[PDB]
Design a protein around this ligand. Structure first.
Ligand SMILES: *[C@@H]1O[C@H](CO)[C@@H](O[C@@H]2O[C@H](CO)[C@@H](O)[C@H](O)[C@H]2NC(C)=O)[C@H](O)[C@H]1NC(C)=O
Ligand SMILES: *[C@@H]1O[C@H](CO)[C@@H](O)[C@H](O)[C@H]1NC(C)=O
Ligand SMILES: [Ca+2]
Ligand SMILES: [Ca+2]
Lengths: 181, 184
């Protein structure tokens, strides 16, 4: 086989299901805004945020909004449409939004690709220039999956609930203490 | 009917709570912001023109046209406010009666003009006017004797209308002019 390096894919789908860039499946039902991918990891160029709200009465949460920060441009995927927020003055990192089948597809010239089925399923793809230079709930993309549970303070834990509770955006959001059944 | 933990991020409605204000941000073009004692402000987009009907007047852009002079008769602000009341189906609440017309408190125009046009309010003299917020400073000096707790809710409102158009005010609160305390 030939040896080229492919794009890497993070998944977020259903009632709180994840697959990291290195292929680690876990469950986290958090109710706040969470860092999905960023490269402001200990200065940075992007950030992708997910907004998880309760969908049901059992305490499980699913993803209902995506915020894409590229430089100073802010997109937002919300209510089956894309919204441009704060387009900067003359920089304007070249992105493209088109609709392919049932999904909405945002692409960037820098290598960042977000695919969204307009309800709860998201696919993030990164060009292979982002190897080992990201963090968040999608891992760090270094082809080694026993360090994907690195917290915000650079500590590899073994719990799904100490890792996922460290990537919340607001400090006053609560901690998830168990996963529902 | 359910208590929310703030911030709250549902996809048409953001409800967040600082140490000072409680903000509500809606996709319908509404923004509410309230410190939890007395100051309440609302912001609407330009979609709702000629449609608003509250105690904030209508939103046509015309100064005092259809709020106070409807059919030629000029409504006083006390009878404009009693028109805006809401009837609750258990409680009878008495409307405030007309007080006897006091003296126009023009013996404190020098203190409100010296205080509110200080050096801290430099780059907002062209953004917000002076004449309404100094008129409101007149009653706060002669209806609130003794301690100064009514004059520093108007200049505190002048420094919020300053920092909403885009300007940046400076610090005016000294140790003897309405100080505020925070821990640490
Ligand atoms: C696919 O990837 C290439 C490689 O990065 C992108 O080409 C870049 O485009 C930007 C502006 O569009 C330039 O500033 C870069 O110099 C280009 N890179 C190179 C190596 O020349 C290309 O834009 C991407 N495709 C799409 C549709 O955006
Ligand atoms: C009503 O029309 C527009 C908004 O619908 C507004 O700008 C205008 O000033 C209003 N005119 C009158 C006479 O109320
Ligand atoms: Ca890894
Ligand atoms: Ca009017």
């Amino acid at each position: 086989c030939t040896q080229a390096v492919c794009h890497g894919t993070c998944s977020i789908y259903g009632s709180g299901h994840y697959i990291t860039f290195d292929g680690k499946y876990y469950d986290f039902d958090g109710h706040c805004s969470y860092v999905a991918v960023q490269d402001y990891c200990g200065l940075g160029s992007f950030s992708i945020i997910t907004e998880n709200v309760p969908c049901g009465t059992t305490g499980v949460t699913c993803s209902k909004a995506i915020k894409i920060f590229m430089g100073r441009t802010e997109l937002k995927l919300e209510d089956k449409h894309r919204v441009v927020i704060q387009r900067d003055e003359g920089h304007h990192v070249a992105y493209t939004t088109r609709e392919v089948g049932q999904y909405l597809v945002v692409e960037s010239s820098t290598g960042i690709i977000v695919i969204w089925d307009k309800r709860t399923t998201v696919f993030i793809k990164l060009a292979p220039s982002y190897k080992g230079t990201v963090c968040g709930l999608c891992g760090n993309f270094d082809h080694r999956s026993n360090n994907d549970f690195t917290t915000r303070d650079h500590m590899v834990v073994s719990s799904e609930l100490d890792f996922g509770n460290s990537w919340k955006e607001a400090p006053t959001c609560p901690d998830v203490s168990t996963n529902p059944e | 009917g359910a208590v929310v933990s703030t911030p709250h991020y549902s996809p048409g409605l953001l409800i967040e709570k600082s140490d000072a204000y409680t903000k509500v941000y809606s996709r319908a073009g509404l923004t509410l912001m309230w410190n939890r004692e007395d100051a309440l402000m609302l912001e609407l987009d330009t979609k709702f023109r000629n449609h608003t009907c509250g105690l904030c007047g209508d939103y046509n852009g015309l100064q005092s046209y259809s709020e106070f002079l409807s059919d030629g008769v000029l409504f006083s602000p006390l009878e404009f406010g009693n028109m805006q009341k809401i009837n609750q189906p258990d409680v009878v609440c008495e409307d405030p009666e007309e007080e006897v017309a006091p003296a126009s408190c023009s013996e404190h125009r020098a203190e409100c003009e010296r205080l509110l046009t200080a050096e801290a309010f430099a780059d907002c003299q062209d953004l917000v006017p002076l004449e309404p917020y100094l008129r409101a400073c007149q009653q706060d000096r002669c209806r609130c004797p003794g301690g100064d707790t009514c004059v520093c809710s108007t200049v505190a409102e002048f420094s919020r209308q300053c920092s909403h158009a885009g300007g940046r005010p400076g610090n005016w609160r000294t140790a003897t002019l309405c100080p505020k305390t925070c821990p640490g």
